[PDB]
Design a protein around this ligand. Sequence first.
Ligand code: FAD
Ligand code: LMT
Ligand code: FMN
Ligand code: FMN
Ligand code: FES
Lengths: 408, 446, 251, 198, 387, 204
Amino acid sequence: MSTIIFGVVMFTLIILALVLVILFAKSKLVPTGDITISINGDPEKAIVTQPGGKLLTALAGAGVFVSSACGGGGSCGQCRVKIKSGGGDILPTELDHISKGEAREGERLACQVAVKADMDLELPEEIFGVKKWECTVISNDNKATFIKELKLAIPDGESVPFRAGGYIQIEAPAHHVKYADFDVPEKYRGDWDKFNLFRYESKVDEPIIRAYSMANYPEEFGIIMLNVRIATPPPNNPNVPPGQMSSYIWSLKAGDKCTISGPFGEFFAKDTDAEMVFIGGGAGMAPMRSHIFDQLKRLKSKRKMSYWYGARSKREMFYVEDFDGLAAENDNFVWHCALSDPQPEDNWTGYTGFIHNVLYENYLKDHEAPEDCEYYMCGPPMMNAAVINMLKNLGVEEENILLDDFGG
Amino acid sequence: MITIKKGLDLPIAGTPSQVISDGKAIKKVALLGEEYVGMRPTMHVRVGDEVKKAQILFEDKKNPGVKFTSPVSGKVVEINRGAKRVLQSVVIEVAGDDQVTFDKFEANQLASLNRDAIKTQLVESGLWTAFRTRPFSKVPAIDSTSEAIFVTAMDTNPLAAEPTVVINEQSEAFVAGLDVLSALTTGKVYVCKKGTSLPRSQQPNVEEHVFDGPHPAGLAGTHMHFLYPVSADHVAWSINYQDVIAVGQLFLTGELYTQRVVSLAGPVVNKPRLVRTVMGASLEQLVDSEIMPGEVRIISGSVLSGTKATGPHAYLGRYHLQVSVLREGRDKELFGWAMPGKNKFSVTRSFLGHLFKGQVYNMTTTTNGSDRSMVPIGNYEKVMPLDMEPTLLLRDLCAGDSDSAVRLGALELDEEDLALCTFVCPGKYEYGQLLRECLDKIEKEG
Amino acid sequence: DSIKKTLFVVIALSLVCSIIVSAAAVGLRDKQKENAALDKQSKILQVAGIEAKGSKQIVELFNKSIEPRLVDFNTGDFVEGDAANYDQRKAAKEASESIKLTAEQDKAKIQRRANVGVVYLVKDGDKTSKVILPVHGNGLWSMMYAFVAVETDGNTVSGLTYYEQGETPGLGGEVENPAWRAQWVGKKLFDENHKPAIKIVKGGAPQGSEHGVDGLSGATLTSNGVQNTFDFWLGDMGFGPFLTKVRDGGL
Amino acid sequence: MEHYISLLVKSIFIENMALSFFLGMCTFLAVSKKVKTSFGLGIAVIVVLTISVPVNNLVYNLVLKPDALVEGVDLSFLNFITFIGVIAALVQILEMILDRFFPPLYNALGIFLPLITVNCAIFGGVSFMVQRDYSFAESVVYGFGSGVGWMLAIVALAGIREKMKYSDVPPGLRGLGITFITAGLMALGFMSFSGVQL
Amino acid sequence: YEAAATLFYTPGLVTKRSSHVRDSVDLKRIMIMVWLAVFPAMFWGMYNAGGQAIAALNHLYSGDQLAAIVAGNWHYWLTEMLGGTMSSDAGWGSKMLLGATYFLPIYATVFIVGGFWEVLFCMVRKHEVNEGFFVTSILFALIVPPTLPLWQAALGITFGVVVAKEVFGGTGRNFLNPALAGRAFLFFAYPAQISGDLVWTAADGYSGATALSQWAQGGAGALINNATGQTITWMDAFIGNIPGSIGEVSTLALMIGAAFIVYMGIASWRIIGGVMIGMILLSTLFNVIGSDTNAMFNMPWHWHLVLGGFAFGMFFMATDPVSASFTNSGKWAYGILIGVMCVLIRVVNPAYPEGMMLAILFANLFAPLFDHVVVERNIKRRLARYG
Amino acid sequence: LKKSVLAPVLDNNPIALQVLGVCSALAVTTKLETAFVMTLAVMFVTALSNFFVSLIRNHIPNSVRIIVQMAIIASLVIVVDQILKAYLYDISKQLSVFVGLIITNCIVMGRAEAFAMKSEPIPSFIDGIGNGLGYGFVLMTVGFFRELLGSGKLFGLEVLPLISNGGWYQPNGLMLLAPSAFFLIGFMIWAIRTFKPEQVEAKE
Ligand SMILES: Cc1cc2nc3c(=O)[nH]c(=O)nc-3n(C[C@H](O)[C@H](O)[C@H](O)COP(=O)(O)OP(=O)(O)OC[C@H]3O[C@@H](n4cnc5c(N)ncnc54)[C@H](O)[C@@H]3O)c2cc1C
Ligand SMILES: CCCCCCCCCCCCO[C@@H]1O[C@H](CO)[C@@H](O[C@H]2O[C@H](CO)[C@@H](O)[C@H](O)[C@H]2O)[C@H](O)[C@H]1O
Ligand SMILES: Cc1cc2nc3c(=O)[nH]c(=O)nc-3n(C[C@H](O)[C@H](O)[C@H](O)COP(=O)(O)O)c2cc1C
Ligand SMILES: Cc1cc2nc3c(=O)[nH]c(=O)nc-3n(C[C@H](O)[C@H](O)[C@H](O)COP(=O)(O)O)c2cc1C
Ligand code: FES
């Protein structure tokens, strides 16, 4: 019995002694002092936080969204920051995302940097322009059998500093929406009723964010135009849940308001004297319209231009009036379109099949310098892969191949 | 001064007689677009266009400002493009004697010209493409400078010509080119040569260095490894002696000088010798009625690092100074691998051939075996005079470990620095392609 | 004040864990000791030739038939003490209770011998039929421990079992083979002059030999180990004087 | 002096922790990819083992050993908790020291730095020391030798794995399985010292 | 058959890239040359095995007992049926025949089983079957006792070919010696059949130790051939008139064979010299230290050379290019380590009388580390801007 | 429920995919009885440590998290050791140091840190049981081959009559040494990743 008490006392004493030693060592070694961070060279808006923690969290608290979309993971980005002091160490986890040629310039991922000492950043000026507007929807009318156009008005008359081809960030809270409430004109409801898609419904639990390219160009002041597709489960896998934000965006009625952020963008045109070739299909119409309108009307460049668009059926074509007007007004721009698998009722006359095949057969097969001109594309992965392969086969270098990408 | 112990002088048959004679008439010349590393051409001509000597044919997208010009006056007759529309050659049919002209200077003024004036003249005339850069063996950017320009006044390739015979005819032009290079260098100019006498330049920048030994002793890679080790921070420029003569002639007479003196030799050449030709000449017409009957392979350059001259590529290379011709060994022999070959060459002592000193072989284009994994019996160490671990470096290249290859010294090498290693590989590997792939990767993502 | 909470949590958790650990460790101590005691007793019964199954039967038979005793190696006389709980290995390791052997004496390569050893007397009644001697020595890979039971004349073996050898199975571990062990019964440890005479014959022992035992096939180093074990433990530095007393009839 | 030299060589070669007792295999197999990373991890293991074995020797001989504190009480059932607590505290203190003074090594093996508490080699070394009843100097020498042997084994495995950049392992074996087979062959080679008793 | 043409003829291929001429040597010739270099050792091993067996048989039995013994063993009565004899006056032909009836079945089994495994792996992986398995199989067949069971030989070759070579990608892709890996598998799996006094002479009921075992027991005075009652001399051990593994006995024949491959540049004289240096150094150190209880302490280097499998390993198994170091400086260290380990295992390890295969397998683990040290020094020299 | 219990058997096996608990696998797999007892002990300890760590997860301070977790684990292992010595004396003797080394078994600490510290008690208990089953799968599979081919026995019952007992089978002596365990685990991983190719590691 006397040994049980000894065992208890010795266990407690040994554990307590080890804990006290660890605490004393921690007190003597770790700094324990606050840190100061300068977001750039050298605004007065220095940030003072406690030691440790993630640099991404510190910037999010300061209000400079990187990114900062999810606060971790490093899955995608557009999650990079520039450092000129403090964080001079190199972490092995950043090399597989940052190339050797650009790592030496002092660029690091925000979600990887650790706040152990005072550091100074070199963020590009564009980041500081990020802020939100509570835009009011002008209209959300339907344009195709699976696509709608959303137009927004900036409150208080504020104008967005942006470059043609940019994209915005859309943020909405949790919601529950049924597909039966969609305001889809009967003109496009034939396939909807054939597939009985109105029976679907969606549920969201927490606020969500997404990115959307804008169909307007700078001369259109105070208006943000977006082209949105319906995230509908495939007929092969109806049991798959539908989209989380596309359903709410489609159900959204005119006159409502939401919060958008940005703009952001890197899919800008190059300032050369060479020809421009634009390729698109379905929802990709927004960046193409932005680029074409900007280049033709605002810049008034004489560079040769052309646009090639792919559609499922003759019912899927929109902006046709604007593009025909542009072609008539300017001899420097001419556009063509082809139907992948139109219905017999379309009574279509013209190019058919894949847009990439049509383009190669009609324009590039006879072009004298396919590599000289620049290629801009945005569309479904099926089209994108074929177009990339065809251009590589023709010998076009990556420096002249540019595209917008989406996924999930 | 410097003696190379490791190497190999290939005892191939048909060695040229070092005497210069007039060559056969040439009707077509071409510029080959695949022999310039990293070149992406922008064509400035089209089939049927008349051209003058030194007129621009195309530029480089990846190297702004560099011009590739016509060696002769005539008409563009072909523009050959291969897989993925890769440019193969631009063929010009000789006609007329039109040309573009430039400024003239006296021998006194050459050593004291502006680097900018020299650069503009060279670039405009198209002679700027004679230079190459270690690492990556690319044409220098027109806005860059190098502290070391290496002149190659020796040739140790098998069946190669004798630089002394050629230089003695153009001593004044050689000296003028040396003066221009001394003005252009910003460091020193290294004239790497053999133990015999050559015309000298009085400028203190120009230094003559003597190399002795078997083949690799005559390579710019070896010369740099021994006199100015190169790396990412230190880059040297390389130019051969005939290009130096061309530079001297350009700056002395104000017009491009496209003459060449190559060696036509090989086991199947009836009368090996040196012949006067023109830059980018047609090898098909050059070797007409000069070879024995049968199926033969014509090579632009040495049998160690040349280019097969077939069809669209049947034209003299830019950096090649010899034409090699040898038979095609498609024969199959019973137990040929087990014979006690008195007529079989090898750097190992497993054949009877090595016992007959001075023997000369009628070598063919055979791979004496099939592809296999590397079993390092120590052949590479016998032919590599540089301070490297050849077997480890080659295994690194084969595995594709570019970072470790750079650490082991890949940045100092050209495809022609591993020709002997490819030669003596029991597994029949070809390390030039692997080295080029690794260098391309380093350049692209570095 | 984080420190207050961390100290409180650590102390409470330590108390809760320690009570359980200590109670478990102290509750099972007697059974843990009894398990080892039973394991020891089983081997002695087996070598003595008494069949026993189960802990109850093992304990009953061991208490009925066996009688541990302590022996002074130098003189072979019995000594008083707790023979049941004596630990000869610890005694040998201890400097106050052991002697450091010399190269000329350390035949078996044990390097140390306890001053007092323990033997077990097999009794079928008032008289004693056998005495069991624990012996050990170095093999090729490890130290090997065995029990040898000798008749009451002090010359004739009745059985031998190796209970801890750790040699190579099939080659050196054959010391545990029942067929090999059965060869020892009837052999005589001493000759007419009362000197050790056990022989581990290489290549097989003669027919009907009274001193030779077949050596292990292909395991001459372990055979040498066994031979050295017996050469030492039958000598003057081992059970020599005690076996002399037994032969004279002091058992 | 011969005693300690023999003990050191025995620990390094005859009783190699990695390839004779086979302890610490999880990290010995995971972190063998690069020679210099293995070198750093082995240095850390050396430091931890050398510091920890003698400290546990002192604690065991002063408190836990039977009859050490009071006549008739044996607290040997606290061996596991005492050993693991000492090892964990030392690992944390070394982690803070490396963080403050050695950012290079800290970032080199930051992920596995806290995982050397669970390395079976250190706990096994402490247990073997307790069994063998070493003195203080013997404990120091034994810990140092065991750490050095573990470092040698892991560095050799890393060298082999680097040499294997030229291999053509089947997809199913690529990685874990081939590393297991390699370690088995290494143990086969290390069996040369089996019969040596030192 | 298809395999016939692809092994007897040459591919008839040409080149495709910048090196338009190639060396005559190839892997096929290299491997066949190494395979031919062990023929004298193989033939002497057969003859010696036959001679030892006949001498032991006539030492043990005679007359009707010998007749019954020969009638009861297929080796013996096949030798007699094919024109040979089993009497004391048997000639070199009879001894060679008796040795052949032991060696040939082992070699055939090893070849067939290992070839099956190699072909299976190469066909499934869609490679081209290549040489070097010839060397592996012949060496494995030569480094085993004459009495090894055939199923054990099959298991050993299976382990060596599959676990050590094919699983890493085949020839040129491994890091360990395949033949020695198979031998070690046998060593540690069935030690009773590859050690002791009952396996090194193929005579029924005969027990006898060999020179390494006898020296460890009683020094140089214990070297006695009990079959003939004579004393083993240095010349006997050098010529190969001693029991042991089949092809290891004749140091003279092994030297004759190795001289050719060393001259041809296939084997590394650097490795051989390193092995010799290490052996001499450690043996002389042991001789100087001395011992009063271990007779192996006073065995000189020239006796170390001619006993056991030292010469065989040094000449033919330590020179495997794939398992060795890839640097000239590292080869010396590799060889020195092999020699030192061999002598150490011979002397201070009482469990094993010989240590060649263990030493080579140990050095196979550390060769890449020597390469690492050398290459790191080279890289530092380069960074100093001296190439 | 069965998802959390059965995933660590083949989909997320500790030894074959996570590389945890290799030492005991190499050590205690020469006899099926010792392998089985080790499997049960690891299951018990991991389940209970997960349960308790999850119970008190909110109140553990970051400064001494390792100390708290290892105190719980070591207490459980000490109790298990006492029970084994009291009731399974022979098997405890055979295991020797590896009963104590359960504390440093990587599986227990990994599951405590990765799951229990952020999950609920019952889920943590189930996760511990599942990981124990996954560990035992490899333990028993290796032990079966090792024991059968090294001693011709299963659970101590003679299956192949040995040559020394008048039988026909000669046991393999390499099956009683670690290299056999290394090779067996390697080939088992090969088979698993052949039947489930999604686990194949990329060439990079
Ligand atoms: C920079 C950028 C710009 C973009 N611009 C545009 C644009 O201009 N126009 C446009 O139409 N799109 C654009 N997109 C695509 C973007 O993803 C849109 O938000 C798109 O409409 C998807 O809508 P969502 O996010 O509501 O659907 P999500 O739910 O994010 O994705 C839909 C898919 O996820 C599946 N899914 C949803 N919930 C679950 C679940 N719980 N489990 C399993 N599967 C689930 C659905 O079945 C469907 O397959 C852009 C993307 C990026 C990155
Ligand atoms: C990858 C990890 C390691 C893998 C290890 C694999 C081990 C595989 C073991 C295979 C089993 C072989 O088992 C062996 O088979 C042969 C087949 O004749 C049996 O037979 C053999 O012995 C008998 C004994 O009476 C002889 O009469 C007979 O001529 C002989 O063939 C052996 O007695 C048996 O021991
Ligand atoms: C792997 C292996 C293990 C061995 N184990 C033992 C052993 O445990 N005991 C033994 O006596 N011999 C063992 N030997 C045999 C010895 O090495 C030695 O050959 C033998 O003792 C000589 O016996 P002999 O005097 O009859 O020739 C083993 C051999 C090998 C290869
Ligand atoms: C290449 C080679 C390596 C060998 N390696 C070993 C070894 O490591 N251990 C061993 O006990 N025997 C080994 N042997 C076997 C011995 O050399 C020899 O055949 C045997 O010892 C003969 O009996 P003896 O030991 O009495 O001389 C090897 C043989 C050869 C040919
Ligand atoms: S924080 Fe989400 S990718 Fe970086």
